[PDB]
Amino acid sequence: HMQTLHVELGERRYPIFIGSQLDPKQLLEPYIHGQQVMIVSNVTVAPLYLSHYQEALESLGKTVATCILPDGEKYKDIQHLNLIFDALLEAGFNRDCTVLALGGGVIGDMAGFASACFQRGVYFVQVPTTLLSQVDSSVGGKTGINHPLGKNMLGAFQQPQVVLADMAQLNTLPERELSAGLAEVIKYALLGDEDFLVWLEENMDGLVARDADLLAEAVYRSCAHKARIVANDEKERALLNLGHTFGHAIESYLGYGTWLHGEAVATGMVMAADLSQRLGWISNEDVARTKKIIQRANLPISCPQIPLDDFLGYMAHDKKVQLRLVLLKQLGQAVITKDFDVELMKQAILANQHG
Numbered sequence: 013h014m015q016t017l018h019v020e021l022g023e024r025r026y027p028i029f030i031g032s033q034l035d036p037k038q039l040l041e042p043y044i045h046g047q048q049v050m051i052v053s054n055v056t057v058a059p060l061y062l063s064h065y066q067e068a069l070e071s072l073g074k075t076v077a078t079c080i081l082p083d084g085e086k087y088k089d090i091q092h093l094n095l096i097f098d099a100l101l102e103a104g105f106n107r108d109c110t111v112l113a114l115g116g117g118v119i120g121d122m123a124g125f126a127s128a129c130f131q132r133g134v135y136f137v138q139v140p141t142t143l144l145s146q147v148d149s150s151v152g153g154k155t156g157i158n159h160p161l162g163k164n165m166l167g168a169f170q171q172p173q174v175v176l177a178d179m180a181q182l183n184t185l186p187e188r189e190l191s192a193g194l195a196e197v198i199k200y201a202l203l204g205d206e207d208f209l210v211w212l213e214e215n216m217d218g219l220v221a222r223d224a225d226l227l228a229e230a231v232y233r234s235c236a237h238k239a240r241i242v243a244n245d246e247k248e249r250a251l252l253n254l255g256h257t258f259g260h261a262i263e264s265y266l267g268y269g270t271w272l273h274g275e276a277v278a279t280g281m282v283m284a285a286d287l288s289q290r291l292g293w294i295s296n297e298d299v300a301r302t303k304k305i306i307q308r309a310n311l312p313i314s315c316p317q318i319p320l321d322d323f324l325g326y327m328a329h330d331k332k333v334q335l336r337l338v339l340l341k342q343l344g345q346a347v348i349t350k351d352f353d354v355e356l357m358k359q360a361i362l363a364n365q366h367g
């Protein structure tokens with residue numbers, strides 16, 4: 013059974029179809045408003061899934077062109093954004109064409125940003141093929157690319173006409189990438205839904221095992237949470253940063269490609285929970301519970317040794333404009349706060365570094 017989540021962001025509205033072995037010819041027909049579709053993918057995802065979408069849209073009568081990018085966060089820059097513009101103009105595509113992002117969050121951001129710039133804005137469709145992009149990139153409307161001096165500093169707000177989330181595509185995902193997605197799923201439960209946490213504890217073995225039905229429920233519940241947070245924020249969104257201030261310092265010190273972002277978020281959530289226990293807000297049992305579910309998702313709960321001077325420098329260089337952290341008053345009840353002892357924060361960092 014396929015599930016549909018209806019998102020309302022900005023003055024725009026779109027469905028997210030979630031299931032397994034979906035038919036893109038059936039699902040996308042109402043959402044391809046013109047004759048032409050540009051499928052953007054990369055050298056890893058395209059040989060696996062491109063023909064599936066190209067053959068479906070061509071059977072629909074559409075003109076399909078493609079732009080296949082190298083695989084990597086390091087290519088998420090304006091030089092490779094330009095390759096999409098090259099492909100779009102080489103194909104002669106017009107104002108009513110659709111750009112279809114086939115891939116993970118890197119492709120989603122690049123194709124989304126390209127779709128906002130081409131002819132000052134064309135249509136955008138998301139087909140996320142990583143778990144993380146399915147539960148994170150599919151709501152929010154942010155698109156972007158990197159600059160040598162700053163990540164995700166160039167981009168556009170661009171909402172899709174539709175998001176198609178097919179769990180079967182997760183079967184070819186590397187194990188670390190799957191776990192990296194589950195880190196974000198766990199995050200939603202820890203910041204705002206203890207019932208969701210209970211469900212993850214009961215079902216984690218099957219999610220790691222890539223049970224199609226359980227994955228689909230986790231994706232639906234994750235997207236529903238983020239859609240609710242951003243919609244309420246428009247009516248805070250900062251709670252989505254649980255674990256990210258700690259995690260950013262981990263990533264920055266370990267360097268490009270050492271840890272996945274979701275792996276850093278996992279350990280950052282442990283540090284956040286640990287600090288929360290030291291502030292007296294949650295119990296040691298709550299921290300143990302948080303470590304256990306993250307570990308069962310095959311995620312790290314401790315990172316290598318990082319000098320505190322460097323760690324704190326990275327947390328202070330990511331400052332919004334006073335340092336505010338996303339911590340836990342209870343499991344499933346995150347808060348953004350300035351009221352923490354910095355000495356206790358250093359203790360929580362050091363406690364979750366392994367030898």
Ligand SMILES: NC(=O)c1ccc[n+]([C@@H]2O[C@H](COP(=O)([O-])OP(=O)(O)OC[C@H]3O[C@@H](n4cnc5c(N)ncnc54)[C@H](O)[C@@H]3O)[C@@H](O)[C@H]2O)c1
Pocket residue numbers: 054056057060083084085088115116117118119121141142144145148149151152153154155156164181182183184185186189
């Ligand atoms: N716009 C947003 O709100 C938002 C949200 C989250 C992340 N992002 C961006 O997303 C990017 C990270 O996304 P990601 O974690 O999906 O990384 P990614 O897009 O680099 O994908 C991870 C790896 O898996 C490969 N891959 C993807 N799908 C596959 C599949 N089905 N089978 C086998 N291999 C597959 C990709 O080629 C890549 O090597 C970052 O640039 C981040 O800034 C944006």
Ligand SMILES: [Mg+2]
Pocket residue numbers: 196256273277
């Ligand atoms: Mg994240």
